[PDB]
Design a binder for these strands. Structure first.
Ligand SMILES: [Mg+2]
Ligand SMILES: [Mg+2]
Ligand SMILES: [Mg+2]
Ligand SMILES: [Mg+2]
Ligand SMILES: [Mg+2]
Ligand SMILES: [Mg+2]
Ligand SMILES: [Mg+2]
Ligand SMILES: [Mg+2]
Ligand SMILES: [Mg+2]
Ligand SMILES: [Mg+2]
Ligand SMILES: [Mg+2]
Ligand SMILES: [Mg+2]
Ligand SMILES: [Mg+2]
Ligand SMILES: [Mg+2]
Ligand SMILES: [Mg+2]
Ligand SMILES: [Mg+2]
Ligand SMILES: [Mg+2]
Ligand SMILES: [Mg+2]
Ligand SMILES: [Mg+2]
Ligand SMILES: [Mg+2]
Ligand SMILES: [Mg+2]
Ligand SMILES: [Mg+2]
Ligand SMILES: [Mg+2]
Ligand SMILES: [Mg+2]
Ligand SMILES: [Mg+2]
Ligand SMILES: [Mg+2]
Ligand SMILES: [Mg+2]
Ligand SMILES: [Mg+2]
Lengths: 131, 260, 167, 155, 188
RNA sequence: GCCCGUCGCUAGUACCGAUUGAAUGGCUUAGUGAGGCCUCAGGAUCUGCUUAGAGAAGGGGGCAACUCCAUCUCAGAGCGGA
RNA sequence: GGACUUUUACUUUGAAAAAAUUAGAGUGUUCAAAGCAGGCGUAUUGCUCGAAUAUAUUAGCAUGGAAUAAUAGAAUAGGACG
RNA sequence: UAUCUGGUUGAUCCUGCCAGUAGUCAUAUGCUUGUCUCAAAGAUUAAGCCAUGCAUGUCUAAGUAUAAGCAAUUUAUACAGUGAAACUGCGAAUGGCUCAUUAAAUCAGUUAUCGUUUAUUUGAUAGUUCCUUUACUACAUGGUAUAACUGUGGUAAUUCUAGAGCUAAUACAUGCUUAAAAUCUCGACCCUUUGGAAGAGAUGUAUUUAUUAGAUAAAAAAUCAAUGUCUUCGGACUCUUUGAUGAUUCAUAAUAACUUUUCGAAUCGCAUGGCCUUGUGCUGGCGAUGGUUCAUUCAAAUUUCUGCCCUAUCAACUUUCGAUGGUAGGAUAGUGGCCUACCAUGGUUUCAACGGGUAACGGGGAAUAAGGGUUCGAUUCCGGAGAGGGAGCCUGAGAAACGGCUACCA
């Protein structure tokens, strides 16, 4: 008898199971940004899934509707605030757009490489984890 | 279920107490008294969760059992004393004087008041009757019983109270156009002058309200507390003066006050 | 070992339902009863032990009984009870007629005494005093608030007369 | 339903604490009592005129009406001084997003201060538990008969 | 024991209803006092929430009031003569509310032949004034004065003797008396 | 070419079936009826209130006459309680 | 305050409305699952934002609507107003 | 977050199911297993059975202390510090577990008490107690009977207990009291009028009964019976007073009485002071426990409207031994066929009664993501039921209690 420690999981695994094309693309994305799982991709594309979802749902509501404005602007400002969404396309018909790579390009893994400091994505992995 | 319940689980506990989910499994169960369970504020919540004056519960019993706190006049030695709306929590030491009053969010707020406003109180006369030996009386929402009141004193009126003695020093009727603090509903906390009473014989009389921001709304007469004249209040309201800014209004205000 | 119980007759044993205040049962809970066995009130050879009580002393002193006397442990603790173990009339002052028990602290021999309850003392008279006082006081107070209201209503009626006169 | 007799029981029938003094030469023999129920259902003239007792009458009885006020279209009067109405409605099933014809039969008490036949729409109001099943009592007849005398013989 | 619930009992459709929970004290009932006559013998009972109820097995005297005379006296209760619920209560001379009893009569005579100075059936100065101010106001009534001749007045009970330990009532009169008389003799 | 039915072997499932077959559970007639509760009684003991005697106390205030309250102690008697 | 009121369905808005769940805002638990925290200086004797909003439907109450679909009304005139 | 793929033919295109595919706050099991945080867990089967231990007891300056208890000191020759045992008081009805029965029951949203109980908390509330009423009733305080204890005992055995000897109270059982005023009844006298009167009793609260007030829907009169205040003695009465609700016989009050008479402080702790007619007079500070009636608060009990899974291989059900209604009582805390008595023949049903099945507690909810749906909820919160099966009950404010008792079955 204590408050239920809540949770929820953080990934969405592939509908189809053995799709060559998608597998290729996955292994690519892993091999660029230095990831170990396909799950590390699943998780990402899932966050993407929910986000784009509420985007659609907001965009069915009427323009200049209270919810649409509050949560729309909130979502946008949030996305940008960590640097995934472009300042230019700052009105959520491009948050509906987006894509996965754009999400990937914000990882500490990656940034610790983009500005040198590692010269190798895997060196990024190991350096990061090693204090 | 064979008798009365003497425990209170968390999550059962009224949300307007603002307790956190973990940290245990129960909350303090309000005792019996002046204010109803589902709409009060036990001394321990206040002295621990609102003021952060004591860290434990043990320390609240420690403080209390030394008569530092006194309620509406008297001392009170009940960790879970049911303190509620319109009351007065005095700290004799520390020099501090509190009136228990609601937010706009509908929560009980800490609110610092004067040494002198802490000498009296306001009580909505919930009932007015005739008693033994002819003595009429009036009884107020905090369970005050006052013998011999002004015959003009009805039901749904409000009343200024000595605290020093008991007696009523002045009373405000329930008329079209009078300052009203809403106790209960979603519009609990808002304050808005009164437009007009929808009668409805037999059940649930309605009260039409509008604040000083030309916004309207409606609540049961049940949940209406007469507190004065347009602009002229009879006690020190708290910040925000119960006006209810929109989600947008508060996103802008809270995020305009941003310069360091 | 089962005990007897006065007035059950029957030279046998039976199983009665017992209560508070009754022989051969001390309860364990407020309004508890147990049904227990009992031996009758009619003597038989089934009896391990008779328990008897002298009422007339015969013609020969039994050794460890009519040769020895043994005190009654305690003495009178209540006001009048003392006054009736000495017969004093509510006059001769209790305080010194009480029973004082000696006992040694090795070389510090002490003497201890009861606590004469229901003794008449100044403090109790002060309390009686304040009772009656508080009563009359609040009574008068009531009368006066009552009058005050009476006026209130009377010179409210005066106001209705004035208002009814205005038109 | 009653009709006739009034004093037709093993017990004497009368209103409670309504002393009529015999020493005084009254013109109406029996002093009567009554009220109006509230909410605006005129305590009909048949009640004050009448001679009956029924301490379950909402106007001459000692049973107060409060709570739900319902209407319903009477379908049973075979029970002395009480009747059964069939209140009808349409119930909404979500899956099909439609309605089905439903109904329930409430037994109500009815003071003889109303004459009723089957067909007449009625307006009843909740009172205390009166019988095992009677939780309501008759307060207005929003009808009359439904043209029975306009169903007469020939020219 | 006796449970005044409605969880026994068929539904109004006559369906048969299942044991749901056992018997509880709060829905209980207790047995009849079946109060009788002679030698006051009352036993309290520990009702719910502290509170006594006074259950009166056997009574003899009761407080009976002359409704249209302004008084109330105490009298030996004679017997019970008529009862609308059950004839047995009559043969068994049981006392319950609304039982038709007979009473002493003589106290109401001692009061009447004092306050009125008229004497039923068949000297002081102030007194003269009183008895003088009181008449055409002393026609009494036929049947009532008749019962006064009998020595035995018909009255109706009002109290619940198996609840309050009391036996109280009002003398029969007028239409009520008319009723219980016509019943008294069309069963005589 | 396909393919149908009896017949024959192996294995599995269900069905009918003497035994008025068997078992479990839930209601229930009739008969029997523990126990607490209520009530009429009972009276192991154990005191009340009233009536009177005998031995002494304490005085409402007198020179003899006169007289209340409480308290203990046994032959003996009326009206109730535990 | 008196005197009376044809019955309904739909729909609107709203009152009444537990928390935890869920959708969701704020906040960088080092991330995240979460949590309802925390954030500012004179970090020597305090300053301070919070602890939102949304759903909550069937029924019941309350309120606007008068389309769509019913229901009742005057024909042996026992009609309508005064 | 709106997809399909294999398998019927020589080939084909359909119908169609099998298999594949994905997730499961969905169990299990096999293989493997390094770090952080998080952390469900004897539900399903068998509400089957249980060894041992523990899970309910509790004290303030303030009810009871002659421990033959410890401490001694610090004023205490009645008590006083501290305090075992015991008495008294309160609690043990919360909690925790389980989900067996339960299918209009529970539960849910929504009503009801003008239909009841209520420990406690908080706010109020009490001058009335005696008696033929001057030779008075303890009020400066009335009664014993009990544990513990001491001592004598019994049984193989238990939270078994007997006989004897003491003694406490906020236990048990009693029992005094307080101002004024008024209104009611009687009424000794005196005197004839139009009539008045010394003074005698009664009148706290509660209980029971009968009667009465409690107005108001706009305004005026004559007369019978009583009968109130003021005479400018034909006469007048003028001002006249009223609560709450949609709604009452409501709150509230008055009259005649009723009652093995409810309550109306025989309690406790810290201080000790004023004040003269110097009585240990007469008063008096803070606050504790109580106490009747009212209100509150925690509750409870019933209760209105609507909503439940499959089933016709269940179509009629309901009164044997209440089924539906009426009158009266009895019972209850209280309404009510809850029960009894008499009286009647009613109540439900194809708009599915009634019966059956549920590997059925109801909800908040969970899972599955076009939507509409489909499946699930024993299980952290709410509500309910039970404690191996039943039934019965004592105590109490509160239980049909089971870490309570009594009986039956096992
Ligand atoms: Mg508490
Ligand atoms: Mg209401
Ligand atoms: Mg004492
Ligand atoms: Mg009938
Ligand atoms: Mg009997
Ligand atoms: Mg078998
Ligand atoms: Mg038997
Ligand atoms: Mg689809
Ligand atoms: Mg093939
Ligand atoms: Mg071929
Ligand atoms: Mg199990
Ligand atoms: Mg000592
Ligand atoms: Mg519990
Ligand atoms: Mg004794
Ligand atoms: Mg009946
Ligand atoms: Mg009843
Ligand atoms: Mg029927
Ligand atoms: Mg089940
Ligand atoms: Mg289910
Ligand atoms: Mg469940
Ligand atoms: Mg199960
Ligand atoms: Mg479990
Ligand atoms: Mg139980
Ligand atoms: Mg078991
Ligand atoms: Mg049990
Ligand atoms: Mg156990
Ligand atoms: Mg238990
Ligand atoms: Mg057997």
């Amino acid at each position: 008898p204590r408050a239920p420690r809540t949770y929820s999981k953080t990934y969405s695994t592939p509908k189809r199971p053995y799709e060559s094309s998608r597998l290729d693309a996955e292994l690519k994305l892993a091999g660029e940004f230095g990831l170990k799982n396909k799950k590390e991709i699943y998780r990402i594309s899932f966050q993407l899934s929910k986000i784009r979802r509420a985007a659609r749902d907001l965009l069915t509501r009427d323009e200049k509707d209270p919810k649409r404005l509050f949560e729309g602007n909130a979502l946008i400002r949030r996305l940008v605030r960590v640097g995934v969404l472009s300042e230019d396309k700052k009105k959520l018909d491009y948050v509906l757009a987006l894509k996965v790579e754009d999400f990937l390009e914000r990882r500490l893994q990656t940034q610790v490489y983009k500005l040198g400091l590692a010269k190798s994505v895997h060196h990024a992995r190991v350096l990061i984890t090693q204090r | 279920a064979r008798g009365p319940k003497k425990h209170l689980k968390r999550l059962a506990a009224p949300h307007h107490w603002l307790l956190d989910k973990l940290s245990g499994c129960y909350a303090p169960r309000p005792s019996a008294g002046p204010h109803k369970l589902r709409e009060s504020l036990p001394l321990i919540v206040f002295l621990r969760n609102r003021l952060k004056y004591a860290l434990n519960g043990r320390e609240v019993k420690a403080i209390l059992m030394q008569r530092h706190v006194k309620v509406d006049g008297k001392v009170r030695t009940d960790t879970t004393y049911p303190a509620g709306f319109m009351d007065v929590i005095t700290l004799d030491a520390t020099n501090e004087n509190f009136r228990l009053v609601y937010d706009v969010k509908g929560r009980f707020a800490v609110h610092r008041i004067t040494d002198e406003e802490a000498s009296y109180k306001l009580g909505k006369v919930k009932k007015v009757q005739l008693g033994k030996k002819g003595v009429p009386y009036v009884v107020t929402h905090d369970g005050r019983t006052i013998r011999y009141p002004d015959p003009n004193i009805k039901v749904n009126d409000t009343v200024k109270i000595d605290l020093a003695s008991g007696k009523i020093t002045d009373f405000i009727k329930f008329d079209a156009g009078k300052l009203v603090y809403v106790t209960g509903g979603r519009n609990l906390g808002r304050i808005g002058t009164i437009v007009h009473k929808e009668r409805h014989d037999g059940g649930f009389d309605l009260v039409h309200i509008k604040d000083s921001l030309d916004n309207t709304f409606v609540t049961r007469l049940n949940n209406v507390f007469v507190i004065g004249e347009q602009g002229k209040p009879y006690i020190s309201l708290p910040k925000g003066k119960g006006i209810k800014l929109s989600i947008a209004e508060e996103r802008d205000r809270r995020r305009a006050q941003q310069g360091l | 070992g089962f005990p007897m119980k006065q007035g059950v007759l029957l030279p046998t044993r039976i199983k009665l339902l017992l209560t508070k205040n009754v022989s051969c049962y001390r309860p364990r809970r407020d309004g508890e009863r147990k049904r227990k066995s009992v031996r009758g009130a009619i003597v038989g050879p089934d009896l391990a032990v008779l328990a008897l009580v002298i009422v007339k002393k015969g013609e020969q002193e039994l050794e460890g009984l009519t040769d020895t006397t043994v005190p009654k442990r305690l003495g009178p603790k209540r006001a009048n009870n003392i006054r009736k173990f000495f017969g004093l009339s509510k006059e001769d002052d209790v305080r010194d007629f009480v029973i004082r028990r000696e006992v040694t602290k090795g070389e510090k021999t002490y003497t201890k005494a009861p606590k004469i309850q229901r003794l008449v003392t100044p403090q109790r008279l002060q309390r009686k005093r304040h009772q009656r006082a508080l009563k009359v006081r609040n009574a008068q107070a009531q009368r006066e608030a009552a009058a005050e209201y009476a006026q209130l209503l009377a010179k409210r009626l005066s106001e209705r007369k004035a208002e009814k006169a205005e038109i | 339903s009653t009709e006739l007799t009034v004093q037709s029981e093993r017990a004497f029938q009368k209103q409670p604490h309504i002393f009529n003094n015999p020493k005084v030469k009254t013109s109406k023999r029996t002093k009567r009592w009554y009220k109006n129920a509230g909410l605006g259902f005129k305590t009909p003239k048949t009640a004050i005129e009448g001679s009956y007792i029924d301490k379950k009458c909402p106007f001459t009885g000692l049973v107060s009406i409060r709570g739900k006020i319902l209407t319903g279209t009477v379908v049973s009067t075979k029970m002395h001084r009480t009747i059964v109405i069939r209140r009808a409605y349409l119930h909404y099933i979500p899956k099909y997003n439609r309605y089905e014809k439903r109904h329930k039969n409430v037994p109500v008490h009815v003071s003889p201060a109303f004459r009723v036949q089957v067909g007449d729409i009625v307006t009843v109001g909740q009172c205390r538990p009166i019988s095992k099943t009677v939780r309501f009592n008759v307060v207005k007849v929003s009808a009359a008969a439904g043209x029975x005398x306009x169903x007469x013989x020939x020219x | 024991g006796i449970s005044r619930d409605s969880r026994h009992k068929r539904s109004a459709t006559g369906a048969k209803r299942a044991q749901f929970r056992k018997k509880r004290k709060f829905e209980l009932g207790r047995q009849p006092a079946n109060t009788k006559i002679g030698a006051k013998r009352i036993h309290s009972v520990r009702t719910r929430g502290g509170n006594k109820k006074y259950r009166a097995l056997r009574i003899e005297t009761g407080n009976f009031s002359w409704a249209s005379e302004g008084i109330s006296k105490k009298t030996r209760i004679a017997g019970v003569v008529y009862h609308p619920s059950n004839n047995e209560l009559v043969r068994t001379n049981t006392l319950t509310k609304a039982a038709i009893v007979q009473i002493d009569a003589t106290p109401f005579r001692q009061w009447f032949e004092a306050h009125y100075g008229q004497t039923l059936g068949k000297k002081s100065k102030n007194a003269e004034r009183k008895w003088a101010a009181r008449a055409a106001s002393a026609k009494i009534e036929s049947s009532v004065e008749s019962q006064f001749s009998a020595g035995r007045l018909y009255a109706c009970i009002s109290s619940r003797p198996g609840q309050s330990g009391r036996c109280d009532g009002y003398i029969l009169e007028g239409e009520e008396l008319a009723f219980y008389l016509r019943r008294l003799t069309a069963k005589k």
